[PDB]
Amino acid sequence: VSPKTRTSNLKNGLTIASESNPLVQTATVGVWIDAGSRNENAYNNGTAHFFEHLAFKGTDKRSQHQLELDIENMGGHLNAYTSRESTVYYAKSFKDDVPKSVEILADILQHSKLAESAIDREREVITRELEEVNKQYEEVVFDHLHATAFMNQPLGRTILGPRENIQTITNTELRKFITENYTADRMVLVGAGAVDHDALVELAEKYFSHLPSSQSPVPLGTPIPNFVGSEVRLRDDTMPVAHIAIAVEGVSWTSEDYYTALVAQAIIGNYDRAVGTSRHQGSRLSNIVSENNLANSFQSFSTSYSDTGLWGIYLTSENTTQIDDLVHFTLKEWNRLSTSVSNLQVERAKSQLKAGLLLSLDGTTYVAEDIGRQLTTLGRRVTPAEVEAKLEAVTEHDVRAWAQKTLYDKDIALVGLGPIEGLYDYNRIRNDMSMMRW
Amino acid sequence: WGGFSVGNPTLQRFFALHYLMPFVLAVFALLHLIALHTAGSSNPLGITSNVDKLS
Ligand code: HEM
DSSP, X not given: OOOOOEEEEOSSOOEEEEEEOTTOSEEEEEEEEXXXXXXXXXXXXXXXXXXXXXXXXXXXXXXXXXXXXXXXXXXXXXXXXXXXXXXXXXXXXXXXXXXXXXXXXXXXXXXXXXXXXXXXXXXXXXXXXXXXXXXXHHHHHHHHHHHHHTTTSGGGSOSSOOHHHHTTOOHHHHHHHHHHHSOGGGEEEEEEESOOHHHHHHHHHHHXXXXXXXXXXXXXXXXXXXXXXXXXXXXXXXXXXXXXXXXXXXXXXXXXXXXXXXXXXXXXXXXXXXXXXXXXXXXXXXXXXXXXXXXXXXXXXXXXXXXXXXXXXXXXXXXXXXXXXXXXXXXXXXXXXXXXXXXXXXXXXHHHHHHHHHHTOOSHHHHHHHHHXXXXXXXXXXXXXXXHHHHHTOOHHXXXXXXXXXXXXXXXXXXXXXXXTTSOOHHHHHHTTSOTTO | OOSSSSSHXXXXXXXXXXXXXXXXXXXXXXXXXXHHTTTOXXXXXXXXXXXXXXX
């Protein structure tokens, strides 16, 4: 039984949330923000990611060099990432270096210079990032997947933004973005590891008290996406491995079917030929794929956003003449979530998930990430007892009913990259979303 | 004819051959398709379709 997550607020509406672990000597403090690329329009798309670069380029007090030195002297590191719906800035340090790290984070968020000289310098760095993501195939596949599934909608945009915007982002629009979005009612100060809650609340009162509040404070994790069944093919015969993602519209964080979608995802599960145990996994798709050498790997996913999600699978394969079999067998396993699953698969997946949801949190950064994610998506940290009860509530009838309305005979978004000549056209893929025998 | 003019022998043999010949025709129709399968169908532009196939 893990220690209780303590939660306090300031007057501006900044949440402070902490989970102490007296067995570790490091601490992760940081700021989770309920804001990301999805808050940009088409003209300033790329701003949030641009800011993340400039946040480390110097503040009104410390210059770029002083900032570098200050963190080096702390002993730990700082890290940041911007996603579609969430931005994070955190600092891992020693137990007693926590007040320094809170002070540095408060500085780079509130008091960053955003000097025209630095904007102009990063404008080239970010331009080079556009031509080097090209190598991270999983990311290429998932960014095309969002672009097509949410065609011409904010969730469909990339985080980097178009080349055109990178050349035209000004310090004005950067400042406007962080003034509109980085407000106290959208922010959570999180501490995990060797942190005292009462100490962290004091540090928040010292550094984050002059944060603007938004005019209309909605609750944390408050959002209309119209999924497009569609396909992107990026054939490249010179690549040896095909990367394929298939997804349907999934569930939001606060859906009533959130746990049902996780259980369904665990029934298919993951596979990787490089792991020794993977040939012995219980999943039917795992057995088909391993016995027939259809794939190097597959990874089921159920990605959630505030108002939508994507549920699907990501496959990698060198077997270029049997891509058709791989896709066929995968979608016939999805069909069985509608037609065939019983208490056998459901109770096995529940067993595996009851542990999996706890196992994931195995270090201070994972704990901080869990507190921050849950506070910015649900407005509260959900206790493991509540999670165990929501999983236990999932029956085989729930899984069948969910799959029948979410998967069965539904449109998919499909992305293929690499030697995908053997991937059939959209209709033949989408025809495997149902079974004529049922 | 089976005789010195078209008559009963001719009619009975034409019946037997008329019944048979469609089966021979079906075999040759199958042969020309198996022969075609090595190149595939041509197309109205006259170029290769190996770049862009549909089931
Ligand atoms: C019982 C008579 C026949 C049947 C059932 C038949 C059936 C077919 C079929 C199904 C195809 C493939 C689809 C198409 O292109 O239309 C085809 C292609 C072809 N047939 Fe026929 N056929 C017959 C008679 C003939 C005759 C009399 C010729 C030539 C004098 C011929 C020459 C061809 C050729 C060259 C092709 C390939 C055309 C291409 O796709 O570019 N067939 N036939």
